[PDB]
Amino acid sequence: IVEGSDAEIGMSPWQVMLFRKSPQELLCGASLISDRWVLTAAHCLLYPPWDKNFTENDLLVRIGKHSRTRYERNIEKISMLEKIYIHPRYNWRENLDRDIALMKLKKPVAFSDYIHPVCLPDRETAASLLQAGYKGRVTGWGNLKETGQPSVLQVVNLPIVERPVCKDSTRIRITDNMFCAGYKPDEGKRGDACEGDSGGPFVMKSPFNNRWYQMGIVSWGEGCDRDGKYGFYTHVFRLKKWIQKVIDQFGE
């Protein structure tokens, strides 16, 4: 997270770390949506241009973490992957469209003060909050600058940007399954997700029921925190039906 700050303990209990066994390293960010389901970006698992195509056994999910590199004894829980499900229409060829994936854990994770699921938005929640200017929150253990690594989970609050502005900031073709966030050059404030943060959650706290909802998944960006550029996010609600069906098909 570029220009973020250290997370408070228990501030993001749904934060999950996609961790590679060999060599042991951070692969991506992710989120806890139930005791057996973790949500992340499809590109974290499958991304041919970067020679990425992990199988369940290559991965480990670390939940309840705060510190980046330290094994948090008596706090974090490390789960194994039973199955990986990538959106059947995720398009890594043209533009990372429908960049979403579900990972079912081998056995249910126990909730605690540091482990708790975030909500997925319903049509109405999405309609009211997914508006230009409304701020969401991005968290992760990714790079602090485009060109080090944090000691602790980082967090930054970023405003949703008008679609025309998002489109006019890049040569990439934006789809409806994406939204962008971040400050404009004249807005003064800054911050953005960066390498190591992708797959992570973009959440918003509904002022209607005071619950946190995951509106986006860190998907792509051109550099990190560059003036005139914005972080792009998978529109979670637009692809919820796929989520529901997977969870009600192979789910538990």
Binding site: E8, I9, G10, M11, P13, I33, S34, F111, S112, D113, Y114, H116, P117, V118, C119, L129, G133, Y134, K135, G136, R137, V155, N157, P159, M204, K205, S206, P207, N210, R211, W212, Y213
Partner: peptide, 27 residues
């Protein structure tokens, strides 16, 4: 989920984190 989005160390004990208000002020 019936208890989703309510944090044990915050919402559950009516404590607010240091920057959530920034979010709410933008809505």
């Amino acid at each position: 989920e019936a208890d989703c989005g309510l944090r044990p160390l915050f919402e559950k004990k009516s404590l607010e984190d240091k920057t959530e208000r920034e979010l709410l002020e933008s809505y």
